[PDB]
Design a protein around this ligand. Structure first.
Ligand SMILES: Nc1ncnc2c1ncn2[C@@H]1O[C@H](CSCC[C@H](N)C(=O)O)[C@@H](O)[C@H]1O
Ligand SMILES: Nc1ncnc2c1ncn2[C@@H]1O[C@H](CSCC[C@H](N)C(=O)O)[C@@H](O)[C@H]1O
Ligand SMILES: COc1cc(/C=C/CO)ccc1O
Ligand SMILES: COc1cc(/C=C/CO)ccc1O
Lengths: 352, 349
């Protein structure tokens, strides 16, 4: 009677992978860009007209698209309306929902679509089959699936390396654009370094904003190899646990959550060493809320903890106090919560 | 209501996109928890239990087991799969766990979830783009054969598929039997695509002077337990169907195109006496893609069929009557309803 409601929830959980994978298909097919591009504002189009812009002849593609688009419409990833024919046949039409703004290329050409592709990638789904073992036997699920850690593995699978760095790059641009309009911590620096900065998108944004500043974008060689040339950006291949380039300030975004506290200590000590006396580590990370609340912002940080649990070299999301404890543990004397964009807080560990 | 767009309206859209990116975390986490027996352990103990206390009940050699459990449970908790209280987090079962733990007759929906989240059934999603662009079925593109054919060659997935269906049907049919009266009267009932025979065995338990025929493909009948009053028969339903006073098809139509369903239903019509009936137990497509849980369940399952089956889809009440009529049946009724599973009757009135 509501036993009914528990049963259905159970059914929904079971098949819940359908939504991401289906959406993954729609993005791969470019079926959102196609909508953004053809459609009147607040207007929507039909699966038949969408199919017409696909490289296909498959009398079935309209029907298949309609079925996909329906599922996304029930979860508000796309809008919809029903148009009843005199016979009573109902035609469905779909439009752009607010989330589409971030799943279709913006002015600048950026979205979160590549990130979705990363997080739905075939490579990242294997690890889940090993989580049960990892809880029993110790180890890390990714390491059990493949013969190595994630980043090593990135240095062997060139497809996933490009998908990962693009995924990271897209996400970070959207966010750094926002951090850069509120946070002022990069003021009065001559050298900035980005430790684990990927293909250097974040560094290029820092320099575009403060031309005087010399960026060093630092990451693993297989990542650096795939880095565009940026005016003001020196790329450097290296390993952060062996040391880190010298600069007035250091930036780590999405680095600490990848590793154990013991690894962050090592990194952080390396950062302390690499800094002048009044220098600092700018830390860009999610912050774990104090409870399992149902909000989107919270499910996101919690989702990523789980990601980290499956792909981890001992990664985890952390509270503010935990970050404070990492700062203290590594010789930092001051701590600042300076801003936040899309669940990414910007913390400063100061050595004052 | 028109919402202007601001930082708040944008931040929410950014966060929703992130949540979609990784939404697969939920059923995979849930899976791992069911695999470790984590829910069942909870079911039988203290009403809140710490991750440490659960771990002490697991054959583990991993000192980080409790912490790892906490991280998975926090994610479940977040979605109301499990409940929590604070000291540390202690965890309790949420109402949904009523159907995810072997509860009463040793039955739950846990084995269905294990079917749905199984490697074999996830692969076909990487082929969906292909099928659409190039034609075909995502599953066949992954495995070189249709899904029922594949079960016949993978013994592991065959057991996992039959178990999933058997334990799902067992819950639903129990409710159908309390509700629906159309089995009463019949002297012979045949279940076409009945699987392991759970449903047939249920029918005879309730109506011991009924003869039941459980009909399915040879490879599935071979794993079917002996039941009082149930005759198991292996065959292909498209070649024909054993004779009965009434035919039951639970979760069959939705596996196939209109064409395939028309052959089936025609076989059923020919297997029946002049007043015979086909009893059809299927979801029915609601009118809109509304956000309720019930509707998501049928829409989820419509998309599943897209990935795995030959022309299978969900259908409106009208499309069902259309199949009924196109197949000789003159009468049509929507009899009852359990857990969004409608029982329709195609009558040769
Ligand atoms: N030992 C190591 N030394 C340097 N970089 C490392 C590393 N281990 C991982 N990384 C890098 O850390 C990153 C984690 S994802 C972080 C990307 C984020 N937008 C950023 O630019 O900071 C990846 O780019 C990975 O290549
Ligand atoms: N051509 C065919 N002939 C007979 N059975 C078939 C078939 N194709 C598929 N099946 C069976 O149809 C079932 C679909 S799953 C449905 C099982 C459900 N609980 C029930 O009792 O109906 C599977 O058991 C599959 O083996
Ligand atoms: C800890 O394991 C990791 C996982 C990822 C995956 C990111 C995709 O959402 C990236 C880096 C890691 O270190
Ligand atoms: C594996 O193929 C099937 C799966 C389901 C449900 C799957 C997961 O929720 C239902 C019918 C099928 O034929």
């Amino acid at each position: 009677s509501s036993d009914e409601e528990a049963n259905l929830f159970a059914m929904q959980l079971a098949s819940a992978a359908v939504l991401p994978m289906a959406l993954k298909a729609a993005i791969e097919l470019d079926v959102l860009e196609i909508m953004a591009k053809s459609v009147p504002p607040s207007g929507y189009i039909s699966p038949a007209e969408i199919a017409a812009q696909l490289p296909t002849t498959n009398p079935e593609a309209p029907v298949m698209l309609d079925r996909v688009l329906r599922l996304l419409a029930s979860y508000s990833v796309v809008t919809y309306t029903l148009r009843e024919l005199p016979s009573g046949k109902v035609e469905r039409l779909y439009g752009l929902a607010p989330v589409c703004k971030f799943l279709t290329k913006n002015e600048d050409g950026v979205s979160l679509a590549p990130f979705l592709l990363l997080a739905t990638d075939k490579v990242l789904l294997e690890p889940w089959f090993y989580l049960k073992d990892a809880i029993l036997e110790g180890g890390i699920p990714f390491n059990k699936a493949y013969g190595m850690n994630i980043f090593d593995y990135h240095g062997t699978d060139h497809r996933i390396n490009k998908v990962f760095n693009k995924g990271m790059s897209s996400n970070s641009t959207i966010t750094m654009k926002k951090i850069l309009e509120m946070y002022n911590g990069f003021e009065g620096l001559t050298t900035i370094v980005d430790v684990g900065g990927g293909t250097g998108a974040v560094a290029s944004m820092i320099v575009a904003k403060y031309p005087s500043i010399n960026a060093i974008n630092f990451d693993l060689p297989h990542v650096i190899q795939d880095a565009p040339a940026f005016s003001g950006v020196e790329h450097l291949g290296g390993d952060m646990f062996d040391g880190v380039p010298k600069g007035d300030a250091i930036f780590i975004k999405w680095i600490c959550h990848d590793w154990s506290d013991e690894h962050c200590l090592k990194l952080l000590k390396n950062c302390y060493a690499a800094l002048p006396d009044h220098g600092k580590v700018i830390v860009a990370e999610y912050i774990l809320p104090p409870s399992p609340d149902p909000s989107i912002a919270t499910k996101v940080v919690i989702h990523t903890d789980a990601l980290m649990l499956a792909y981890n070299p001992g990664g985890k999301e952390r509270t503010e106090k935990e970050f404070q404890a990492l700062a203290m543990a590594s010789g930092f004397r001051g701590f600042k919560v300076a801003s936040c964009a899309f669940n990414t807080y910007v913390m400063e560990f100061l050595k004052t």
